Design an enzyme around this catalytic site. Structure first.
Site, PDB file in Angstrom:
ATOM      1  N   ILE A  68      -5.443   5.128  -6.004  1.00 16.52           N
ATOM      2  CA  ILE A  68      -4.728   4.504  -7.125  1.00 16.52           C
ATOM      3  C   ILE A  68      -5.259   3.103  -7.426  1.00 16.52           C
ATOM      4  CG2 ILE A  68      -2.494   3.737  -7.983  1.00 16.52           C
ATOM      5  CD1 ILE A  68      -1.092   5.918  -6.453  1.00 16.52           C
ATOM      6  N   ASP A  90      -7.598  -8.033   5.256  1.00 10.35           N
ATOM      7  CA  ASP A  90      -6.635  -7.127   5.892  1.00 10.35           C
ATOM      8  C   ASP A  90      -5.254  -7.562   5.374  1.00 10.35           C
ATOM      9  OD1 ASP A  90      -4.844  -5.667   7.427  1.00 10.35           O
ATOM     10  OD2 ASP A  90      -5.805  -6.184   9.353  1.00 10.35           O
ATOM     11  N   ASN A 143      -1.104  -3.030  -4.272  1.00 17.99           N
ATOM     12  CA  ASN A 143      -1.257  -1.581  -4.138  1.00 17.99           C
ATOM     13  C   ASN A 143      -1.473  -0.997  -2.715  1.00 17.99           C
ATOM     14  OD1 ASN A 143      -2.468   1.263  -5.152  1.00 17.99           O
ATOM     15  ND2 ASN A 143      -4.054   0.225  -3.911  1.00 17.99           N
ATOM     16  N   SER A 188       7.523   3.728  -4.455  1.00 16.72           N
ATOM     17  CA  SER A 188       7.237   5.164  -4.519  1.00 16.72           C
ATOM     18  C   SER A 188       8.546   5.843  -4.841  1.00 16.72           C
ATOM     19  CB  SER A 188       6.766   5.715  -3.146  1.00 16.72           C
ATOM     20  OG  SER A 188       6.769   7.152  -3.144  1.00 16.72           O
ATOM     21  N   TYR A 230       8.577   5.113   5.921  1.00 19.95           N
ATOM     22  CA  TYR A 230       7.980   5.026   4.593  1.00 19.95           C
ATOM     23  C   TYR A 230       9.039   4.706   3.535  1.00 19.95           C
ATOM     24  CZ  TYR A 230       4.851   6.064   0.631  1.00 19.95           C
ATOM     25  OH  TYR A 230       4.055   6.024  -0.492  1.00 19.95           O
ATOM     26  N   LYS A 273       9.099   1.036   1.472  1.00 20.95           N
ATOM     27  CA  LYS A 273       8.922   1.007   0.018  1.00 20.95           C
ATOM     28  C   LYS A 273      10.186   0.474  -0.681  1.00 20.95           C
ATOM     29  CE  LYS A 273       4.749   2.673  -0.561  1.00 20.95           C
ATOM     30  NZ  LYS A 273       3.659   1.823  -1.124  1.00 20.95           N
ATOM     31  N   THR A 284      -5.142  11.693  -4.815  1.00 18.30           N
ATOM     32  CA  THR A 284      -5.899  10.708  -4.038  1.00 18.30           C
ATOM     33  C   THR A 284      -6.032  11.261  -2.600  1.00 18.30           C
ATOM     34  OG1 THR A 284      -3.965   9.516  -3.084  1.00 18.30           O
ATOM     35  CG2 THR A 284      -4.678   8.784  -5.280  1.00 18.30           C
ATOM     36  N   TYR A 321       5.987  17.237  -0.019  1.00 23.67           N
ATOM     37  CA  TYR A 321       6.711  17.102  -1.284  1.00 23.67           C
ATOM     38  C   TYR A 321       6.731  18.356  -2.151  1.00 23.67           C
ATOM     39  CZ  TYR A 321       6.204  12.135  -0.064  1.00 23.67           C
ATOM     40  OH  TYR A 321       6.225  10.877   0.467  1.00 23.67           O
TER      41      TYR A 321
HETATM   42  N1  LIG Z   1      -0.841   9.021  -3.978  1.00 23.45           N
HETATM   43  C1  LIG Z   1       0.461   9.180  -4.263  1.00 23.45           C
HETATM   44  O1  LIG Z   1       0.938  10.245  -4.621  1.00 23.45           O
HETATM   45  C2  LIG Z   1       1.359   7.968  -4.161  1.00 23.45           C
HETATM   46  C3  LIG Z   1       0.932   6.747  -3.637  1.00 23.45           C
HETATM   47  N2  LIG Z   1       1.823   5.649  -3.585  1.00 23.45           N
HETATM   48  C4  LIG Z   1       1.430   4.332  -3.095  1.00 23.45           C
HETATM   49  O2  LIG Z   1       0.330   3.912  -3.899  1.00 23.45           O
HETATM   50  C5  LIG Z   1      -0.536   3.058  -3.103  1.00 23.45           C
HETATM   51  C6  LIG Z   1      -1.952   3.633  -3.060  1.00 23.45           C
HETATM   52  O3  LIG Z   1      -1.892   5.024  -2.675  1.00 23.45           O
HETATM   53  P1  LIG Z   1      -3.201   5.932  -2.596  1.00 23.45           P
HETATM   54  O4  LIG Z   1      -4.262   5.299  -3.446  1.00 23.45           O
HETATM   55  O5  LIG Z   1      -2.844   7.327  -2.832  1.00 23.45           O
HETATM   56  O6  LIG Z   1      -3.686   5.683  -1.098  1.00 23.45           O
HETATM   57  P2  LIG Z   1      -4.979   6.115  -0.190  1.00 23.45           P
HETATM   58  O7  LIG Z   1      -4.531   6.365   1.199  1.00 23.45           O
HETATM   59  O8  LIG Z   1      -5.793   7.042  -0.975  1.00 23.45           O
HETATM   60  O9  LIG Z   1      -5.673   4.645  -0.267  1.00 23.45           O
HETATM   61  C7  LIG Z   1      -4.834   3.521   0.063  1.00 23.45           C
HETATM   62  C8  LIG Z   1      -5.451   2.138  -0.139  1.00 23.45           C
HETATM   63  O10 LIG Z   1      -4.757   1.211   0.714  1.00 23.45           O
HETATM   64  C9  LIG Z   1      -5.766   0.382   1.216  1.00 23.45           C
HETATM   65  N3  LIG Z   1      -5.491  -0.301   2.466  1.00 23.45           N
HETATM   66  C10 LIG Z   1      -4.946   0.325   3.550  1.00 23.45           C
HETATM   67  N4  LIG Z   1      -4.791  -0.544   4.536  1.00 23.45           N
HETATM   68  C11 LIG Z   1      -5.246  -1.702   4.043  1.00 23.45           C
HETATM   69  C12 LIG Z   1      -5.282  -2.928   4.713  1.00 23.45           C
HETATM   70  N5  LIG Z   1      -4.811  -3.099   5.967  1.00 23.45           N
HETATM   71  N6  LIG Z   1      -5.781  -3.967   4.003  1.00 23.45           N
HETATM   72  C13 LIG Z   1      -6.215  -3.819   2.728  1.00 23.45           C
HETATM   73  N7  LIG Z   1      -6.176  -2.645   2.100  1.00 23.45           N
HETATM   74  C14 LIG Z   1      -5.693  -1.566   2.733  1.00 23.45           C
HETATM   75  C15 LIG Z   1      -6.970   1.275   1.404  1.00 23.45           C
HETATM   76  O11 LIG Z   1      -8.291   0.662   1.464  1.00 23.45           O
HETATM   77  P3  LIG Z   1      -9.170   0.638   2.795  1.00 23.45           P
HETATM   78  O12 LIG Z   1      -9.807   1.950   2.827  1.00 23.45           O
HETATM   79  O13 LIG Z   1     -10.223  -0.400   2.601  1.00 23.45           O
HETATM   80  O14 LIG Z   1      -8.378   0.338   4.003  1.00 23.45           O
HETATM   81  C16 LIG Z   1      -6.908   2.146   0.188  1.00 23.45           C
HETATM   82  O15 LIG Z   1      -7.670   1.452  -0.842  1.00 23.45           O
HETATM   83  C17 LIG Z   1       0.124   3.014  -1.744  1.00 23.45           C
HETATM   84  O16 LIG Z   1       0.965   1.859  -1.630  1.00 23.45           O
HETATM   85  C18 LIG Z   1       0.946   4.292  -1.662  1.00 23.45           C
HETATM   86  O17 LIG Z   1       2.044   4.241  -0.726  1.00 23.45           O
HETATM   87  C19 LIG Z   1       3.151   5.774  -4.072  1.00 23.45           C
HETATM   88  C20 LIG Z   1       3.572   7.019  -4.599  1.00 23.45           C
HETATM   89  C21 LIG Z   1       2.676   8.103  -4.642  1.00 23.45           C
HETATM   90  O1  LIG Z   2       4.672   8.368  -1.808  1.00 26.88           O
HETATM   91  C1  LIG Z   2       4.082   9.494  -1.945  1.00 26.88           C
HETATM   92  C2  LIG Z   2       2.876   9.764  -1.232  1.00 26.88           C
HETATM   93  C3  LIG Z   2       2.205  11.007  -1.380  1.00 26.88           C
HETATM   94  C4  LIG Z   2       2.769  11.988  -2.261  1.00 26.88           C
HETATM   95  C5  LIG Z   2       2.253  13.273  -2.537  1.00 26.88           C
HETATM   96  C6  LIG Z   2       2.935  14.146  -3.448  1.00 26.88           C
HETATM   97  C7  LIG Z   2       4.142  13.755  -4.099  1.00 26.88           C
HETATM   98  C8  LIG Z   2       4.654  12.474  -3.819  1.00 26.88           C
HETATM   99  C9  LIG Z   2       3.975  11.628  -2.922  1.00 26.88           C
HETATM  100  N1  LIG Z   2       4.603  10.436  -2.775  1.00 26.88           N
HETATM  101  C10 LIG Z   2       5.769  10.375  -3.564  1.00 26.88           C
HETATM  102  C11 LIG Z   2       5.893  11.743  -4.322  1.00 26.88           C
END
Ligand SMILES: NC(=O)C1=CN([C@@H]2O[C@H](COP(=O)(O)OP(=O)(O)OC[C@H]3O[C@@H](n4cnc5c(N)ncnc54)[C@H](OP(=O)(O)O)[C@@H]3O)[C@@H](O)[C@H]2O)C=CC1
Ligand SMILES: O=C1CCc2cccc3c2N1CC3
Ligand SMILES: NC(=O)C1=CN([C@@H]2O[C@H](COP(=O)(O)OP(=O)(O)OC[C@H]3O[C@@H](n4cnc5c(N)ncnc54)[C@H](OP(=O)(O)O)[C@@H]3O)[C@@H](O)[C@H]2O)C=CC1
Ligand SMILES: NC(=O)C1=CN([C@@H]2O[C@H](COP(=O)(O)OP(=O)(O)OC[C@H]3O[C@@H](n4cnc5c(N)ncnc54)[C@H](OP(=O)(O)O)[C@@H]3O)[C@@H](O)[C@H]2O)C=CC1
Ligand SMILES: NC(=O)C1=CN([C@@H]2O[C@H](COP(=O)(O)OP(=O)(O)OC[C@H]3O[C@@H](n4cnc5c(N)ncnc54)[C@H](OP(=O)(O)O)[C@@H]3O)[C@@H](O)[C@H]2O)C=CC1
Ligand SMILES: O=C1CCc2cccc3c2N1CC3
Ligand SMILES: O=C1CCc2cccc3c2N1CC3
Ligand SMILES: O=C1CCc2cccc3c2N1CC3
Lengths: 259, 259, 259, 259
Positions: free
Chosen positions: C18, C64, C91, C141, C155, C159, C190, C200
């Site tokens: 994202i 970090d 994010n 989320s 989690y 959030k 992702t 889910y």
């Molecule tokens: N995907 C989904 O369906 C949903 C996602 N979210 C939220 O959206 C956000 C992004 O999700 P998504 O992109 O799917 O996640 P991914 O697991 O695909 O990627 C997560 C990101 O978090 C970064 N990150 C993790 N740890 C650190 C750290 N210690 N310092 C700096 N950066 C860090 C990672 O980068 P790096 O590799 O460099 O560590 C990566 O860019 C999150 O907060 C997640 O909870 C909320 C609802 C739904």
């Molecule tokens: O927070 C997360 C992480 C991953 C994920 C996968 C599918 C559906 C949904 C999620 N959510 C909320 C709803």
């Protein structure tokens, strides 16, 4: 085991379903109950009879809740019969499913007249008659806030409206010392549930066996069972106790943690 | 007048304030109570004494709720003393005001360790020990969802977190037949209220006389009065009754309809 | 087609998922972007490269986010590189599933340090550096408010906390003319989604083919498709426009109406 | 600077107030606008004239939104004039204050017919006519969820109902590729605001000078100012962009973070 001893309750649509469960649980705890019914006269007298067997006093009074003048008449009669009122449970309601394109003004009016306007007037009458320490409880539904359900705008909107009434009436009833809350139940085993539960069951379809529906819904409940009218009546009983005084102007979901 | 007879309750931070009011109202209704305290040993024994005068059993047990290992120890001792547990009231907490730019990791950690992590572990221990028909109740605040309050991100965030715990734990405790709810009180007369209420009073300023604060807050309440620990204890008592079984996974505001 | 021309954005965890989608959509509209990454250095430079191909400026900066001093360093470097900041997208985050009984202080701390504390400090840094007309957007989320999901208290709580931060920071950033909102996405394609989506999906189980998961989730969406990083980046872009100024202190669900 | 170029919008009650601000901001961005009015014909033509000066096309069409058959006629005419529709802004509404005991069926019906039923039919017509990529936006108010406001059950309930319609219609409009959201504004400078704002001002009383009201409300806003129709029109413009596609079935408060 009679925390509500000496109190008088009025429940709209108490001849069957949730209304009946609420009337019975309130009476089991000491309240005299006005069992209102729209057209189920025989079920209502049956409830009055069940109350008597529990040692509670009750009286069946017909009133079409979708007509404000009849809601006013219902209260006048209830007060004439028991001398006053303490608890008002606004329960009467109808489910409704319709392609939004097909909704007519007539259908809209029918739904809102009962589900919303009726509750407004029942609440007005509660403000008018409830004694100090009294309680007014409206009935919404988790469907008012659920997402992903189709052809349900009339039901969702008519129930959401009542949540706004709850917050407003709580302010309006304060000087009289009457709290106002709103319950939002999840599925509860009743005629309405048996006719409409498929719409809420995961993977539900029209024609799905009721036992499969019941099993699917119970599996989605932390308590691993479906709710029954007694579960709602017990919670409402607790809300009617003096102990619940500080809970006011709230929409409380009664779901056992499920759907 | 003993609906909770034979049950055992544990209340964190029960030596004074809301915690004390909850312990007393539960004991007044039959529960034996574990009065946990962080450092107010004398207040805690005073509560145990008040319980005795009400005919209730109680025991004061020290435990720093901001330290998970001590929360585990607290439960082990409570179970050793009363043989089991039914109700767990997670109440300990602190207010905190700070310019966000000035917040340090140390302050952040201090607030979350008590207000959030502490409640997570108290809830874990409730899942581990609560008997069937048990209850776990966490403490949030209306401040978790209020708008217009400055320099309060640590408090708002630490309390909002607990609302997420409530929904999660309700699912996790289902198989054990233990419900999990969260209370979100409005202002309640206590030491925390006397130190922090000006921030919530309409037109409040630091140095505003407490009587003026009390009057301003009461005027914003439909019931025309401020809440007291007993109001919270009474509501929690009702939530601890068997009748409240169908209320599960909910955040309930305890405000009397006010602020 | 450059509404954000001349603005500078910082996105935490923008190397993939994202975060990357948000960085790309902001850059596509004119913003210079600071692509923060925790450990995915190669993905981050790839994003900087994608930005360049879109005619946008970008720079990869490691930090970090679970360590407050590194969040402060990240901002100092971003400001040193682009001379100022306008938009801050918090994010970075992690999913986490665990039997509540098995949660240790170490796991708790790990989750809250990134998901919650990290966002608090990113927000503090936004208050410290965002120019007038700026925007701070936190990431929650729909799981923070969902019911029926087991082994997910860390989690959900981490959030939900951020939603409290959003309301607080909006008040705190007002004088500076910076709005603060929080996005709460539904499932978005992702790495996190591919690892966690089964939890889910209706009728989901560990080991369910990803295509079946995708199909089940899309079928529960009014738009009949799953969300992608670009959908989130587009919405965030709209929130970053001057036009969104009156939207402040809000938690906005980004679900396409689904789950 | 024309993101909405080639699109057609219909705004109910666009002759003045918020409706006018929305019509103007949509037209400023390229949309042709159907300016509906109930009885303010002269104001409506004035808006059409303002649109022309901005280079936007517009047409004033009278229709009593409290009458479903006229809502249907309004859409037929709008489609006849511009050949199709993309965006539907359901804005018409009335404030209403009344001692609940004094509310008559006639007053109830008058309020719900416009504020609720009217919006249902406008939404039905949007489902019937909106082209793919279209948008339907209903109008609630923060008063639907506010606490502490007296004599306001009709307004609170009529607006809360629309929030239920929003979630329902989002599901119902999905197949057509039309999103449905609901805006809930805080105070916005208009005729309704000038007549009713005292009820919302801290320490407000009937007869309080409007400048004092404005100052009290602005002081309660993080942005230190009151909202204006343009603020609402700008936000609605952003929601009408392709970028907002993933925001669906949501109630969005438009308050600048204030009241
Ligand atoms: N995907 C989904 O369906 C949903 C996602 N979210 C939220 O959206 C956000 C992004 O999700 P998504 O992109 O799917 O996640 P991914 O697991 O695909 O990627 C997560 C990101 O978090 C970064 N990150 C993790 N740890 C650190 C750290 N210690 N310092 C700096 N950066 C860090 C990672 O980068 P790096 O590799 O460099 O560590 C990566 O860019 C999150 O907060 C997640 O909870 C909320 C609802 C739904
Ligand atoms: O927070 C997360 C992480 C991953 C994920 C996968 C599918 C559906 C949904 C999620 N959510 C909320 C709803
Ligand atoms: N069952 C469920 O799962 C849920 C139900 N609810 C709500 O709970 C309430 C009761 O539901 P439930 O018991 O299942 O409903 P049923 O359909 O089983 O019974 C509904 C009651 O409404 C009464 N009623 C209907 N019309 C009128 C009228 N015009 N005047 C007076 N009374 C009337 C009926 O009595 P009569 O036969 O005399 O007309 C009946 O007593 C409703 O408001 C419903 O929307 C909310 C969430 C879930
Ligand atoms: N009062 C109000 O208006 C409202 C209060 N609340 C919440 O209600 C709860 C109680 O508030 P209130 O009674 O007013 O608070 P007070 O400040 O009056 O007392 C708080 C309690 O927390 C306990 N406590 C603090 N730290 C620890 C610790 N490290 N370990 C164990 N116990 C600890 C204290 O006991 P000890 O002295 O032994 O340390 C004390 O019993 C809190 O969570 C608060 O945030 C929520 C809304 C409103
Ligand atoms: N102003 C504020 O602070 C807030 C306003 N709102 C809501 O925003 C919307 C607009 O408010 P605002 O602009 O301030 O209102 P005003 O009272 O200033 O104007 C309201 C509009 O509603 C129209 N209208 C009224 N009745 C009808 C009818 N029967 N048929 C067609 N159109 C009608 C009016 O046009 P005509 O003159 O032709 O009848 C007018 O254009 C309303 O829904 C209101 O409840 C929500 C929160 C705050
Ligand atoms: O309002 C109703 C009516 C009937 C019904 C059957 C099953 C589940 C649920 C319902 N609800 C809400 C959740
Ligand atoms: O959380 C707290 C602590 C103290 C306090 C004093 C007055 C009013 C209110 C509070 N709250 C919420 C509302
Ligand atoms: O709905 C309305 C109408 C008028 C008004 C004037 C001031 C403040 C607010 C309003 N609201 C909500 C908040």
């Amino acid at each position: 085991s009679k925390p509500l001893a000496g109190k008088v309750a009025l429940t709209t649509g108490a001849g069957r379903g949730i209304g009946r469960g609420i009337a019975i649980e309130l009476g089991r705890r000491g309240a005299s109950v006005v069992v209102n019914y729209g057209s189920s006269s025989k079920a209502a007298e049956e409830v009055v009879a069940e109350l008597k067997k529990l040692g509670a006093q009750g009286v069946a009074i017909q009133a079409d809740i979708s007509k404000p003048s009849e809601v006013v008449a219902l209260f006048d009669k209830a007060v004439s019969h028991f001398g006053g009122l303490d608890f008002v449970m606004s329960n009467s309601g109808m489910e409704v499913w319709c392609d939004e394109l097909e909704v007519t003004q007539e259908l809209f009016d029918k739904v809102f007249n009962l589900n919303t306007r009726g509750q407004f007037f029942v609440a007005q009458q509660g403000l008018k008659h409830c004694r100090r320490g009294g309680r007014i409880i409206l009935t919404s539904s988790i469907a008012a806030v659920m997402t992903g359900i189709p052809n349900h705008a009339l039901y969702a909107g008519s129930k959401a409206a009542v949540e706004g009434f709850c917050r407003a009436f709580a302010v309006d009833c304060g000087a009289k010392g009457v709290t106002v809350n709103c319950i939002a139940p999840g599925g509860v085993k009743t005629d309405m549930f048996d006719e409409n539960s498929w719409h809420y069951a995961p993977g539900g379809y029209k024609g799905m066996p009721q036992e499969k529906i019941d099993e699917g819904l119970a599996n989605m409940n932390p308590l691993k069972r479906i709710g029954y009218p007694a579960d709602i009546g017990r919670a409402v009983s607790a809300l009617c106790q003096e102990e619940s005084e500080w809970i006011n102007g709230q929409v409380i979901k009664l779901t056992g943690g499920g759907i």
